[PDB]
Structure formats: C-alpha cells, structure tokens
Design an enzyme around this catalytic site. Structure first.
Site, PDB file in Angstrom:
ATOM      1  N   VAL A 256      28.024  31.787  30.852  1.00 37.02           N
ATOM      2  CA  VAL A 256      28.745  32.989  30.446  1.00 37.02           C
ATOM      3  C   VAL A 256      28.668  33.183  28.929  1.00 37.02           C
ATOM      4  O   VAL A 256      29.039  32.282  28.177  1.00 37.02           O
ATOM      5  CB  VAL A 256      30.231  32.906  30.865  1.00 37.02           C
ATOM      6  CG1 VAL A 256      31.012  34.104  30.342  1.00 37.02           C
ATOM      7  CG2 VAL A 256      30.352  32.812  32.380  1.00 37.02           C
TER       8      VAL A 256
ATOM      9  N   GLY B 234      27.757  28.806  36.441  1.00 39.03           N
ATOM     10  CA  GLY B 234      26.618  29.424  35.737  1.00 39.03           C
ATOM     11  C   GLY B 234      26.800  29.379  34.228  1.00 39.03           C
ATOM     12  O   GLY B 234      27.363  28.422  33.697  1.00 39.03           O
TER      13      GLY B 234
ATOM     14  N   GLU C 287      34.754  42.435  31.917  1.00 44.32           N
ATOM     15  CA  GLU C 287      35.571  42.824  30.771  1.00 44.32           C
ATOM     16  C   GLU C 287      35.938  41.548  30.022  1.00 44.32           C
ATOM     17  O   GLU C 287      35.950  40.477  30.613  1.00 44.32           O
ATOM     18  CB  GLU C 287      36.828  43.582  31.209  1.00 44.32           C
ATOM     19  CG  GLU C 287      38.023  42.691  31.491  1.00 44.32           C
ATOM     20  CD  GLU C 287      39.179  43.437  32.111  1.00 44.32           C
ATOM     21  OE1 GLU C 287      39.358  43.314  33.338  1.00 44.32           O
ATOM     22  OE2 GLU C 287      39.901  44.137  31.371  1.00 44.32           O
TER      23      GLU C 287
ATOM     24  N   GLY D 249      30.632  29.363  27.688  1.00 50.85           N
ATOM     25  CA  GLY D 249      30.736  28.138  28.466  1.00 50.85           C
ATOM     26  C   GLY D 249      29.742  28.117  29.600  1.00 50.85           C
ATOM     27  O   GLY D 249      29.114  29.136  29.915  1.00 50.85           O
TER      28      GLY D 249
ATOM     29  N   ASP E 217      39.900  29.058  44.337  1.00 51.32           N
ATOM     30  CA  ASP E 217      39.728  28.181  43.175  1.00 51.32           C
ATOM     31  C   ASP E 217      40.716  28.519  42.062  1.00 51.32           C
ATOM     32  O   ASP E 217      40.363  28.557  40.876  1.00 51.32           O
ATOM     33  CB  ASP E 217      38.280  28.243  42.668  1.00 51.32           C
ATOM     34  CG  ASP E 217      37.914  27.065  41.770  1.00 51.32           C
ATOM     35  OD1 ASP E 217      38.562  26.000  41.867  1.00 51.32           O
ATOM     36  OD2 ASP E 217      36.976  27.217  40.967  1.00 51.32           O
TER      37      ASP E 217
HETATM   38  C1  LIG Z   1      34.910  30.192  34.330  1.00 51.34           C
HETATM   39  C2  LIG Z   1      33.776  31.219  34.276  1.00 51.34           C
HETATM   40  N1  LIG Z   1      33.383  31.617  35.597  1.00 51.34           N
HETATM   41  C3  LIG Z   1      33.464  33.043  35.681  1.00 51.34           C
HETATM   42  O1  LIG Z   1      33.184  33.725  36.677  1.00 51.34           O
HETATM   43  C4  LIG Z   1      33.933  33.560  34.350  1.00 51.34           C
HETATM   44  C5  LIG Z   1      34.261  34.725  33.609  1.00 51.34           C
HETATM   45  C6  LIG Z   1      34.641  34.309  32.314  1.00 51.34           C
HETATM   46  C7  LIG Z   1      35.057  35.222  31.324  1.00 51.34           C
HETATM   47  C8  LIG Z   1      35.176  36.612  31.455  1.00 51.34           C
HETATM   48  C9  LIG Z   1      35.642  37.338  30.351  1.00 51.34           C
HETATM   49  C10 LIG Z   1      35.983  36.668  29.160  1.00 51.34           C
HETATM   50  C11 LIG Z   1      35.867  35.212  29.042  1.00 51.34           C
HETATM   51  C12 LIG Z   1      36.238  34.553  27.793  1.00 51.34           C
HETATM   52  O2  LIG Z   1      36.635  35.222  26.859  1.00 51.34           O
HETATM   53  N2  LIG Z   1      36.144  33.164  27.662  1.00 51.34           N
HETATM   54  C13 LIG Z   1      36.529  32.528  26.382  1.00 51.34           C
HETATM   55  C14 LIG Z   1      35.705  32.441  28.709  1.00 51.34           C
HETATM   56  N3  LIG Z   1      35.591  30.991  28.574  1.00 51.34           N
HETATM   57  C15 LIG Z   1      35.259  30.061  29.630  1.00 51.34           C
HETATM   58  C16 LIG Z   1      36.235  30.177  30.784  1.00 51.34           C
HETATM   59  C17 LIG Z   1      33.810  30.289  30.076  1.00 51.34           C
HETATM   60  C18 LIG Z   1      35.375  28.664  29.045  1.00 51.34           C
HETATM   61  N4  LIG Z   1      35.340  33.056  29.910  1.00 51.34           N
HETATM   62  C19 LIG Z   1      35.417  34.463  30.099  1.00 51.34           C
HETATM   63  N5  LIG Z   1      34.552  32.946  32.297  1.00 51.34           N
HETATM   64  C20 LIG Z   1      34.117  32.473  33.514  1.00 51.34           C
END
Ligand SMILES: C[C@H]1NC(=O)c2cc(-c3cccc4c(=O)n(C)c(NC(C)(C)C)nc34)[nH]c21
Length: 273
Positions: free
Chosen positions: A20, A18, A89, A13, A135
């Site tokens: 990810v 940013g 993680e 996303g 948040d």
């Molecule tokens: C929302 C976004 N901002 C962050 O700092 C962070 C970390 C994750 C993140 C960390 C570890 C695993 C996942 C994951 O498995 N998914 C599916 C997602 N999806 C979104 C939230 C980016 C849609 N984020 C993870 N997502 C975000």
C-alpha cells in the site's frame, strides 16, 4: 490510466494484504492510498453486477461504500496483467490503532468507549450491507486524528455475510474464536463479536489477551491493567466460549459500559489534539 491520474508517494506498508502506497489524485490533489495485490495471492474471487471477475475485496468494498465514513471508501480500481490495484480514500493526518495503542499503552476507558462504539457502528454497517469483515483488529482500524473518526480497512479476508456455517478462514488467528480453533467452524456474527472482545481487551489493556491456541480454547481472561468491572463484564461476555452465549450487537451497545459515548469531535478535542 493509473499513471496519469495518480501521483505515487512512499510505501505505507506491506504484508499479507499486499503493498500500500501513499498517493495523490492529480486532478484535485485528493489524498489517496494505492493498494497493489498480486493475482496469485488472491484465493477469494467474486463477480461484479457487470459480470466481471474481480477480487472479493472489490465486491465487498463496493457493497459498503456510501456517505458513511466508518469504512474506508473504494474510489477506483484497475486490473493489470498480474495484479489488481485499489484506490482508497486516505485521511490526513492519520494513525492506525495498533501504532496508537503501542505509543500510548492502555487507553483511558472514555477513549476506548468512543473508539469501540465507532468500530461497532462500522461493523454493523458492513453487516447491514451483507458484508462480513473477518479480520477486525487494531491494525485494520485507522484513526482520523483531526475529526476523531475511526475507519475499517482491508476487506481482503472478508466474505459475503450468510447465516450458514463458515469453514474457511484467512484472518488473524489470535483474533479468531475457539470454535474455529477446535472445529474449523464458525458463524459470522458471533465470530465477529469474539474478535470485538479481543479488540476491546487490547484497547483497555495495551495488548491482546491470548497468544496460543490453548489460551483461546480455555478462554480465561486475566486483566493485566486496572479495568472497571463493567468493562470487564462486557469483555468476558464477548469472549464467551459458546457462540450463542455471546452478546448481539444490540446487546453490546446497550451494555452499561457503553452509555454516554463521546461524539468523535469531542473525542479528538479531549484525547487526540
Ligand atoms: C492494512 C492494509 N490492508 C488494506 O487493505 C489497507 C488500506 C490501508 C490504507 C488506506 C488508506 C490510508 C492508509 C494509511 O494512511 N496508512 C498509514 C496505512 N498504514 C498501514 C495500515 C498500511 C500500516 N494504511 C492505509 N492500509 C491497508
């Protein structure tokens, strides 16, 4: 350094936080998430014990990292010419709470209680470690579907916890308290409790209670789904207009609605598996 150690997967996303990506640590196949943040988009800067200029988010994540699984663990980080890269993680299988509520609609109260309780434990851990998230919302909570464990993510709007007034805010407005809307002033704990009230409402009704500023300021809660009187009371208490009328974390967790919470694994067996 980053290239050799991690194998990059699909984009998970992107947005204000940013970009990810899914990923795998090559050495042991550990599932990870790789967050890229452009330097121009970082306004909140901090400094490590080492005396190195990093994003506040990195400082905050190091301060909350431990064996406690209620907060996403920072495994590593890297500086690039125009960006920072965070290795987080990644539970597997996983679904964020926003998508989960979208698919199910309103959650059964037993499930909402388990989930809300875990969020409360996670937020308390952050506060105990000197960290304010700023948040808290469904989009920033991951559900480990196998173990039934929730994890807080994204400390990009966070700050060091303090007892004095905050006059900056960069979190999600519809989760922000009336004192921020009206006066651009809030205190950490009581603002967090407000966002928790929004989150609980979201869990038990399928959507947030307020859209516009005037709704936030009026603070009148209307229940669009059948919600028990005890749960309604807790929600209305968290959403008290005056910050000092809001419950403490202790008072939330001693509230009658919060009694006899399921364990995470029990939660997964009954509601997720
Ligand atoms: C929302 C976004 N901002 C962050 O700092 C962070 C970390 C994750 C993140 C960390 C570890 C695993 C996942 C994951 O498995 N998914 C599916 C997602 N999806 C979104 C939230 C980016 C849609 N984020 C993870 N997502 C975000």
């Amino acid at each position: 350094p980053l290239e050799s150690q991690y194998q990059v997967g699909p984009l998970l996303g992107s947005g204000g936080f940013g970009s990810v990506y899914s990923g795998i640590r090559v050495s042991d196949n550990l599932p990870v998430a790789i967050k890229h943040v452009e330097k121009d988009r970082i306004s909140d800067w901090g400094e490590l014990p080492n005396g190195t200029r990093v994003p506040m988010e990195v400082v905050l994540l190091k301060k909350v990292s431990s064996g406690f699984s209620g907060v996403i663990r920072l495994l590593d980080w890297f500086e690039r010419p125009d960006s920072f890269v965070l290795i987080l993680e990644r539970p597997e299988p996983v679904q964020d709470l926003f998508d989960f509520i979208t698919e199910r609609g309103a959650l059964q109260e037993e499930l909402a209680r388990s989930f809300f309780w875990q969020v409360l434990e996670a937020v308390r851990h952050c506060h105990n470690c000197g960290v304010l998230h700023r948040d808290i919302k469904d989009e920033n909570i991951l559900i480990d579907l196998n173990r039934g464990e929730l994890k807080l993510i994204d400390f990009g709007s966070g700050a060091l916890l303090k007892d004095t007034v905050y006059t900056d805010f960069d979190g999600t407005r519809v989760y922000s308290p009336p004192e921020w809307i009206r006066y651009h002033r809030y205190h950490g704990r009581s603002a967090a409790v407000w966002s928790l009230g929004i989150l609980l409402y979201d869990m038990v009704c399928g959507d947030i209670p307020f859209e516009h500023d005037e709704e936030i300021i009026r603070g009148q809660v209307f229940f669009r789904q059948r919600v028990s009187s005890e749960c309604q009371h807790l929600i209305r208490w968290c959403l008290a207009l005056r910050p000092s009328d809001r419950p403490t974390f202790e008072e939330i967790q001693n509230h009658p609605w919060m009694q006899d919470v399921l364990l995470p694994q029990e939660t997964a067996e009954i509601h997720l598996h």
